[PDB]
Symmetry: C3
Subunit: 335 residues, 3 copies
């Protein structure tokens, strides 16, 4: 009986980081408690000052990643402060029943609720807001994130050998539908409510205006690049709650990848590019072998470079000429 | 030799049901005989009364699912009544040769033809009309359905364990390209041929006006919701003859899924959302554990809730608080 | 050490053919040397005379396929002739470090460079141009191709059994973004640079004007249809550097398919339609069992038949009535 299990509290951290956690654990099932507080806020999403009347869990896109182990119970207190203007709820693709929890968590501004479910299936799973009658708007406006449910004995390759990472990063990719006025410029709305009708018109075209990692063009670049070093193994968690994407790490690979994001299935290896179906989260492991600034992107290259679905990984360490060597630098064609 | 095997006649049923059949069978190979009659008709596809100048196998979108076992031969009599305007035929993705049967089943109005092929590969396979030079149009206007070739000893998990279902449901998803006039309203055409030029313009934009399950918005909802109960295992067969989709059961999972639809391959488990490549049929098993109304949808949520790609499953039974419980109902935040 | 391994030179051949190679080999690792020369050129891409200001590796869309074996080193000399307008480079998805090679092969017109990398992972991998700030334009204008890294002991089925092909064909599929003038007709530009701004605005709409195999509508039809015969096994290599596609052989199957294109993973069998993610190359084997003209296409049928993503395979041999038979030819409905 779950009420009699030990309860532990986890403090969530902002993306792209993930809160500390164990992979293989000797611990038995717990009720792991989390709190998230909804925040509606206008956000600048590109270098030209275009804004999004956004909606978020915990003030970020994506929402923070919640990690537990298979057999644990997730107990979330969802808070919708009075400072907000719209109702919300939460649907966990990792949960069973009641439309993922959305039926049991309808919180209007000024309310909160607490939900518990058993995390009985391992994998990366999307959670997102889903108010009846306007699910897409709330999702495309920013309300999604990942629940990672690791197996108790950690991650395994297809032969049962253990796989281990030194660091997890979480990337949420958001297809945005920002309206334009008659002058062809993006509209800037004084209120969330005012953005609704025009935004739904754009959504229905199925053509996003921007596709961003972690909330804006350039979110994971420059000072905010992800970081690693040669010999380090990273897990890259990638969520897309509404639309397909095809992650790729330029100059690297997916050493082991769960593109459908479910760890009881054997991963695939050596992938150049993988595929995250809209409404899911997948995960890739990679162990760096070369230093340099890598790009991690959606390999529809228009969506990456023109619409924003690209970030970087700055990697420290020593260059390996056996893996790759510039035999002759760019020079005049022999005459 | 095929001519010397026992012949048997199966009566097809209208989607979303699937005609009665065995999973594991003791029976040996048979020539299984099916008849289908092409019906061109004007159908109402949304709640505003928009119409499609539709083309169907047997009067429904999708056509009925034909079920046989691996090793059986399928023998179809395709009738094109005199009252239709156009020539038609049939291409079975499950068959080998002559463009899937299409070159051997060219029936003009007033004609019929009979085709036999060996169903030597197990899986769900799309069949669709494919008249030379008119293929996209006949397919997007409704002419597709599923052939399921069950393995003789039934469905297997990756370790070879048997998987069994209590009820199969068949969902066809249709991307529709309905034209609009200068006033921005959907056009209503008196004849099939009248719809052609305008429909082709809309098709070339690759943007569907509507995406529907089983022929219309709301087809699998209300009185026509699918049904199940706690403890029951359903097989959800999903076809999309022209365009990708990404099925998801909200509040549930894909316990075992063949997203590429081919049963000699091992399935994957615990999927939140899977992927049906345009031009294919796939199949998912799920055993319900909670009662309630579930949504089964294409998890591009715009595609689902704005354009029509969603249905419901009403599930009877007892709520299980271990799996999910409302610890605290929505209430005001302590001030 | 790579410097001391034997070096051999391979002469590339024009798609759809692949240069002669072994599958299983007794040879040890080698540094395999290749040369490619970039050709910018205006090309006619459809039957009404529409032109693309194209960029190519070696004069063709796709660039030729490079075949080596796992553990070999690839050593490419990349030549950008004095007569081209733009800088180029190469990113091998099969290589590790320096953005796939891109940072080490920045060749302005009149320059060349030589890159070595270890092909330590088996599979079909995209290579494509990637000059900083112009990646999408160069890829969609035609600068991509496949590296096939064959395992030393050749292709294997899921149980470890060997799989052998008699002939490989390489199909590169290109989503094109050709601009239109105010009159609604496709623009025809005098120079490459003239095409830039307009092309970028089409690209951002995410809607291709054309999607073609090997450079143009009907490139692989008529006199240029691919060829085979009953009993022959072919390997069909399919690359898409920018956008998803869903290949299908009409009247056939993918007997064994690596849709993510990585040969250390077990393939899937009996596929009707497979899925090549944007930014990847995949591979399918089929053994022909019926003669006739097959269509090989992207099974979004609008993309295939309206936009151009279709070709043909003409197959010689003897019809097999057990696989498929016209029991009754089209004839009047009985009365
Ligand atoms: O490797 N894609 O830029
Ligand atoms: O079988 N696709 O036309
Ligand atoms: Cu919300
Ligand atoms: Cu969802
Ligand atoms: Cu037809
Ligand atoms: Cu087809
Ligand atoms: Cu280039
Ligand atoms: Cu690339």
């Amino acid at each position: 009986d779950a009420d009699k299990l030990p309860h532990t509290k986890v403090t969530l951290v902002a993306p792209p980081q993930v809160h500390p956690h164990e992979q293989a654990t000797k611990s038995g099932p717990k009720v792991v408690e989390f709190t998230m507080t909804i925040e509606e806020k206008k956000m600048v999403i590109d270098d030209k000052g275009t804004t999004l009347q956004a909606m978020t869990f915990n003030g970020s896109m994506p929402g923070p990643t919640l990690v537990v182990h298979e057999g644990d119970y997730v107990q979330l207190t969802l808070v919708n402060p009075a400072t907000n203007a719209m109702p919300h709820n939460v649907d966990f693709h990792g949960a069973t029943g009641a439309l993922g929890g959305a039926k049991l968590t309808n919180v209007n501004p000024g309310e909160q609720a607490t939900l518990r479910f058993k995390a009985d299936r391992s994998g990366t799973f999307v959670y997102h807001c889903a108010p009846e009658g306007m699910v897409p708007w709330h999702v495309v406006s920013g309300m999604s994130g990942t629940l990672m449910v690791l197996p108790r004995d950690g991650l395994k390759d297809p032969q049962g050998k253990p796989l281990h990472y030194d660091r997890a990063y979480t990337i949420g990719e958001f297809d945005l539908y920002i309206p334009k006025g008659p002058d062809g410029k993006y509209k800037d709305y004084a209120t969330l409510a005012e953005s609704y009708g025009d935004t739904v018109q754009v959504m229905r075209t199925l053509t996003p205006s921007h596709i961003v990692f972690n909330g804006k063009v350039g979110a994971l670049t420059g000072a905010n690049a992800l970081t690693a070093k040669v010999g380090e193994t990273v897990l890259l968690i990638h969520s897309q709650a509404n639309r397909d994407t095809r992650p790729h790490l330029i100059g690297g690979h997916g050493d082991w990848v769960w593109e459908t994001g479910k760890f009881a299935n054997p991963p695939q290896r050596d992938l150049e590019t993988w595929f995250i179906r809209g409404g899911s989260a997948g995960a890739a492991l990679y162990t760096f072998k070369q230093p340099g600034v890598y790009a991690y992107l959606n390999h529809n290259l228009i969506e990456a470079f023109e619409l924003g679905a690209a970030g970087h990984i700055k990697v420290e360490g020593k260059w390996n000429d056996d893996l790759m060597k510039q035999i002759k630098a760019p020079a005049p064609i022999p005459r």
